[PDB]
From a paper:
LDH and MDH are homologous, 2-ketoacid oxidoreductases that share both a protein fold and a common catalytic mechanism. Both enzymes are found in central metabolism: MDH catalyzes the interconversion of oxaloacetate and malate in the citric acid cycle, and LDH converts pyruvate to lactate in the final step of anaerobic glycolysis. Following a gene duplication event roughly 700–900 Mya, one copy of this MDH evolved a novel substrate specificity to become a highly specific lactate dehydrogenase (LDH) that is now essential to the life cycle of many modern apicomplexans.
Each protein was crystallized with multiple substrates or ligands (lactate, malate, and oxamate inhibitor) and with NADH (resolution ranging from 1.35 Å to 2.05 Å). In the following, therefore, the descriptions of the models are primarily based on enzymes crystallized with oxamate inhibitor or lactate, which are highly similar. The ancestral AncLDH* and modern apicomplexan LDH structures are likewise highly similar (RMSD ∼0.8 Å for the loop-closed states), while sharing only 63–71% sequence identity. The conformations of the ancestral and modern active sites are nearly indistinguishable, with only small differences in the specificity loop conformation. In both the ancestral and modern LDH structures, Trp107f and Arg109 are the only residues from the specificity loop that interact with the substrate. As in the modern LDH structures, ancestral Lys102 does not interact with the substrate but points away from the active site into solution.
Numbering used by the authors:
A (entry chain B), D (entry chain B): 5 to 334
B (entry chain A), C (entry chain A): 5 to 329
Write the structure that this text describes.
């Protein structure tokens, strides 16, 4: 027969479980919840199985501590890693501090994807996002188009939400993109914000929103992750991160050709190569099918290049870790 | 108790039945299917009721030949009318030719809404759309914000589909608007086409689409209705018209504040007043909450004004039939 | 790349177009609308394509007059055929009278499936359903588990709707099956009707429904198709038939293991073999995965056997037309 | 205008947030997330707002620490309370130990519903469920039909899932009910389990499932909550509890006339009155529109009555708490 789709969630914490719940609600495919922690993914998987019965969906949800259970996955979504570095206050939370904790996890996960599901589409969520996706790509041996990072869909959703709230319109009808690194140097593209294709500038000229208010929204978008960390007190955001990665997964599974901002492998676009960074892309059954090259103004391009320089600085730290290949398997 | 929403579909032909099906699938509210043809709406309502059981939804679908069954409707959607004028060929199909048959029907429907459901949000579909909506409005007594015509969501869906197909991207990510009259002088707004906010011009510059291809798509959008009439051989489009009207209805029922192009009563926007014509609008729980006045270029403004002039010409026929002015 | 599912709809009339609309709303897969009428499926496909843009779904809808476009289909759903026999009144409508017109069409469709998409799961709708499915199966060469007819989900949806309406509960919570032939000798299984597993008998005992009311509902279920034919005046039911077939298709495409009554090839269950007739079945990725043999009472068994005998009589006509045996 | 529906979630912890996410996904109405903990509901509400933008839904999600923000709620769902009593091991987890912690919370919540949204339909989740719903009803002054407890939909979903898994059929097609108290003396109604109306017994007679396997499933259903507590290590189940309460809310909001097992106020049915206990009911726009009286056999009825006696024993403990009315307002 043609089997249900199979989605493995490497990491069964807050984002992992929430993504599994979306998969159950949406009947996307069978789900494997993998974690290093014993019993917990099996417990969440039982709860999620019960929830599938309530939803009248037909979804097997399996919890596991064994990588071999990811064999034959169509999609793999990776959240394995730490959310907050120890000995740091909430207010000084930085994704950058997670780097030395999370890089070695990416190598392990990569080696296991290489062994058990080398044909999967792989979405990395673990921070610091743009360099974690590079480590994973390097150690997994996957095709450049079959690995990407979730960040832009989340950052863009934030930008959209804040603009839509201010204008009092449906967020369906706001288009907004945030490109570059997933961090403080992300680049919300104000000039590209539209309301059903109507430039945001029209609304400014009509006095429905001011430049000052837009500038505030751009900064709120940059700071949104930390805003939620400060309010929650434990961990980080999960409902929107989960939804963002599932939107990407959906695009792959059903070959939708969505235009989504993701951290993608560049091969010369925007003047850069051999790194992953946030750019608009077409996502379909071939994975990252196209990186779209925006006609950025010199000012936007300078912001983007400065963003990329933050990824290059993190990449130097990854190199200073020294990670050998074929550590776990080959 | 708070009751389910009640949606009355005045006209139970192709579009009306298809809209009822969406209401059953989406569990939007109870549905009244009204028509002047005896027994037909009752038959469709039984079929639709069976289909709600299959969908596991909770929807009463009532077919009727009596206007009294529209009492208390939250939303009324009007498709009553002819699709093709008697004695005309398919090749010469024109929405304008429907005018003398359908205008009288709008008057009658309006009179009934006025007594039975004056607080409804009313969506007109019957062609020729922009003048039909004005007849309905005038004879119903409804507030200007509580009546509109479905056209621009359909015309825009065509523009979006054709652009998305050429670019090979999801239509979710194509924004395209068509404003003006729902007819040959509709105005597909090429300058406003975006792919997730990215101007279509960027894709031209990169050679992903040519200006000639866009020009073809613009004309294909204008001609889409008659293309489908000629292909089908019977009637006219209905799957997309139904979905477009239901999108509008959902925006009202759930106070969504959608930005949708609809035929709206103008009160000076674009330099025009006291007609309905297609414009971007915010649709929510107060109906047409705002008409958005685009910063049209002089050339776009001219195209819009020539579109409005087609509505004004049709309105002269309405006045000459004794149906208002 | 793993491609989208491909669903071919052989017949692009009322049911075929409505099923395409569900596929577009539900984003089930790309759709091919095939018909012998030139240009009509192409027109509907354009309309449906526009409607997918409105739905924000990602669905190619292709209309065609060429069987070659069914190549590689995952699912094929067959509605090609007549709905009413020429020269008969509505009051005397009988599915049996369609047999000599529609049987030849099943042969032709089968021959094409055999070369172009022999690995498809095939759902037959064309009437008279139980014998049409057997002609298709025989001339297609498909495995017995890969072909079935849609009938029992529709008949059961009617039984469910009528019971749910009388009890004033959600039809989600009514389980009712109708087995046997899709015709006047269908068998609504009163003893198996439940409300969330609670036997209907409990509601009789409490006076929420009477035996006379149930008896009326049983007959209304049997007569439902012809009731809708008489009300509509044109054609026959389509909203519930479409939804029923799409429910079946979804069970296959997503390996759901739904328990649905379908016309299935019997291999000794109920004491019968080598015919298709309505039985409860588990539908999943291997098609008809299991026929469930109910513990019928002697009286129920007799009703089922008399239903099977109606299929056997129709099959004699099939043999006499030279279409198998 | 006719406003969106308004759903207030009193308690913004694991179940509360998860219910808010379902409301955002399903576009059920605007959501108020109330909690006594400062900042946390506001943080979750931001994350959920972002997720609504991703979902293309039109949902306002507000976090609050003020009861007045529940004014005009159509539905109120209460999870306010403790999940695990202190100083107890996971293996000895009991809903009964939560009683003295949670009763006073119910009085406070009730008094505020009375003041701010007396026309709401109220779904209680806080354990120990059947007596918490009684405390809430007593102190809120709501109509008997406008308050109920979520338990049976969850317990029944579990019974359904386990049966459906064993038979390898869609859980849509399994009907199973668990009635009585939400605890160890719940009563899974084996005789009423059906597969599209086909008695489970047919499947036993055909050898597709054994009585021994059914008996195991009945006990697994009784123990399911504790099973998940043991596996998770922290807190209790949330994905299915949330889904269960939203299914009940949906039934109300859209007047669906669903047949759902809920903890309902009895007025003589089953031989009992003036308590809430799990029974099948029709749920629609009038709330609990009908309690269905099953034709229980004497053996099933004995199990049900013993279940009710557990609720009566908890109720005596509630009485021994002594709670005065008009403590917070009136
Ligand atoms: N974008 C737009 O605004 C579109 C507009 N249309 C128009 O919508 C209208 C309906 O199209 P279809 O549903 O396809 O046509 P249809 O012919 O299938 O149905 C029209 C129904 O109106 C009924 N009707 C006629 N006079 C009536 C009366 N006084 N009251 C109640 N019902 C009455 C008829 O009996 C018939 O069932 C046509 O005028 C057509 O031109 C259609 C497509 C797109
Ligand atoms: N429960 C059931 O099994 C139900 C069965 N039916 C049956 O389904 C069939 C279709 O019903 P509708 O869609 O309402 O009819 P319809 O008349 O609207 O469409 C049938 C289509 O089949 C096409 N067709 C005829 N010969 C063909 C050929 N060789 N190949 C391709 N297409 C061809 C026609 O041109 C037409 O478009 C009828 O036989 C009807 O009795 C209908 C309702 C319920
Ligand atoms: N936009 C973004 O890209 C974005 C947004 C939010 C969170 N994040 C990141 O996502 C990651 C997960 O966040 P969360 O809230 O789900 O965290 P969490 O702490 O709730 O869960 C992470 C899980 O990873 C597991 N884990 C640790 N090591 C592992 C290993 N070697 N293999 C498998 N599992 C392992 C842990 O046991 C834990 O269950 C964090 O790195 C966080 O910074 C990124
Ligand atoms: N089937 C059932 O009925 C069922 C199933 C699961 C959980 N539960 C119960 O649901 C309740 C909630 O579980 P959870 O996992 O969401 O717990 P949780 O600890 O994650 O959240 C409970 C929240 O209640 C808040 N709270 C405490 N006192 C409050 C007050 N006076 N007002 C408002 N908020 C207050 C807390 O601050 C906390 O955020 C528990 O009592 C648990 O036993 C019942």
């Amino acid at each position: 027969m043609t089997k249900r789709k199979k989605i493995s969630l490497i990491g069964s914490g807050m984002i992992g479980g929430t993504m599994a719940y979306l998969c159950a609600q949406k009947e996307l495919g069978d789900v494997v919840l993998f974690d290093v922690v014993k019993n917990m993914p099996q417990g969440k998987a039982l709860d999620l199985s019960h929830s599938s019965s309530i939803a009248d969906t037909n979804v097997k949800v399996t919890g596991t501590n064994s990588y071999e259970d990811i064999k034959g996955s169509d999609v793999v979504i990776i959240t394995a890693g730490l959310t907050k570095a120890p000995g740091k206050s909430d207010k000084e939370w930085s994704r950058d501090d997670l780097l030395p904790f999370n890089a070695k996890i990416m190598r392990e996960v990569g080696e296991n994807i290489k062994k058990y599901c080398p044909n999967a589409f792989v979405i990395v969520i673990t921070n610091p996002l743009d360099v974690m996706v590079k480590v994973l790509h390097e150690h997994s041996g996957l095709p450049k188009n079959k690995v990407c990072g979730m960040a832009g869909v989340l950052d863009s959703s934030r930008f959209r939400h804040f603009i839509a709230e201010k204008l009092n319109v449906s967020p369906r009808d706001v288009q907004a993109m945030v490109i570059g690194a997933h961090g403080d140097k992300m680049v919300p593209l104000t000039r590209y914000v539209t309301v059903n294709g109507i430039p945001l500038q029209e609304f400014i000229k009509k006095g429905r929103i001011t430049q000052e208010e837009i500038d505030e929204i751009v900064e709120r978008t940059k700071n949104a992750g930390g805003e939620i960390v400060n309010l929650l007190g434990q961990g980080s955001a999960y409902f929107a991160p989960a939804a963002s990665a599932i939107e990407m997964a959906e695009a792959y599974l059903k070959d939708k050709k969505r235009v989504l901002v993701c951290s993608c492998y560049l091969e010369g676009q925007y003047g850069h190569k051999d790194m992953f960074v946030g750019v608009p892309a077409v996502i379909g059954g071939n994975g990252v099918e196209k990186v779209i090259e925006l006609e950025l103004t010199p000012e936007e391009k300078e912001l983007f290049d400065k963003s990329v320089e933050e990824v290059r600085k993190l990449q130097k730290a990854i190199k200073a870790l020294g990670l050998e290949h074929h550590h776990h398997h080959h």
